[PDB]
Structure formats: structure tokens, C-alpha cells
Ligand binder design. Structure first.
Ligand code: GJC
Length: 105
């Protein structure tokens, strides 16, 4: 299970999941709702996957956790136009995360 040294990561993820711009990223990108995603995006990532991985002890380091958070936003800007609703949400959430991360590093 999760080492207590990563509790601050657990809290950042909780706060991201609560954010009103987080809705595109709560669960894996869903083939029932969009086609051609994994055709382009070789490493999908979403907050639920991160939440379960963190809780079961699947992250060793905060940097590994942060890399997955940035992967969410990088995938978003790869697939989505910047002025689309999801594309804008990714930019908001990247700002939100980088701000929380800077409080610690
Ligand atoms: C656009 C796909 C995408 C999502 C995403 C997550 S979730 C979601 N969608 C939720 C369901 N809606 C329709 C709908 C509305 N309602 C409520 C009602 N009042 O009916 N129910 N279904 C359509 C879009 N898209 N995330 C990412 C990162 C994406 C991409 C391409 O990168």
C-alpha cells in the first residue's frame, strides 16, 4: 500500500479530482464516447488509474506520480484542440497541478 511519505500526492490528486475542470480526466478516455483515441495516444492516463495505483503502493516516488499527472495533460494537448472544451480543461488542470506541486518543491 501507499507509503505515508506520498500522502501529499494523495491529497493533490483528491483536490484535482474535485476541480470543476477535472471532469474530462476522472476516468480513462472512454471508447464509448470518442473514437480513435488509443490510435494516437500510446500511454493513456487518468485520475482514477492514478488514485488506485497510488493507494495500492504502485508509485515509489513523488516524481513518478507527477510524471503520470503531466501525462494526463500532455495526452490532452496532443489529442485535443487548444480551444476545445477538453483542451481548455487540460490547460486549467496543468496550471492547478503545477501550482500545488510548487508549494512542495
Ligand atoms: C471528449 C472525450 C474526452 C474526455 C471525456 C471524459 S467524459 C466525456 N464526456 C462525457 C459524456 N458526454 C456526453 C454526456 C453528457 N451527459 C450528461 C447529460 N445531461 O446527459 N452524459 N453523457 C460526452 C463527453 N468526455 N476526456 C478526455 C481527456 C477526452 C479526450 C478526447 O481527450
Amino acid at each position: 500500500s501507499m507509503h505515508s511519505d506520498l500522502t501529499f500526492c494523495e491529497i493533490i490528486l483528491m483536490e484535482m479530482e474535485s476541480h470543476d475542470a477535472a471532469w474530462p480526466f476522472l476516468e480513462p478516455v472512454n471508447p464509448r464516447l470518442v473514437s480513435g483515441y488509443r490510435r494516437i495516444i500510446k500511454n493513456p492516463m487518468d485520475f482514477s488509474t492514478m488514485r488506485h495505483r497510488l493507494s495500492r503502493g504502485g508509485y515509489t516516488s513523488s516524481e513518478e506520480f507527477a510524471a503520470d499527472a503531466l501525462l494526463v495533460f500532455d495526452n490532452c494537448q496532443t489529442f485535443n484542440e487548444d480551444d476545445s472544451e477538453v483542451g481548455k480543461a487540460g490547460h486549467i488542470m496543468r496550471r492547478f497541478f503545477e501550482s500545488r506541486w510548487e508549494e512542495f518543491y
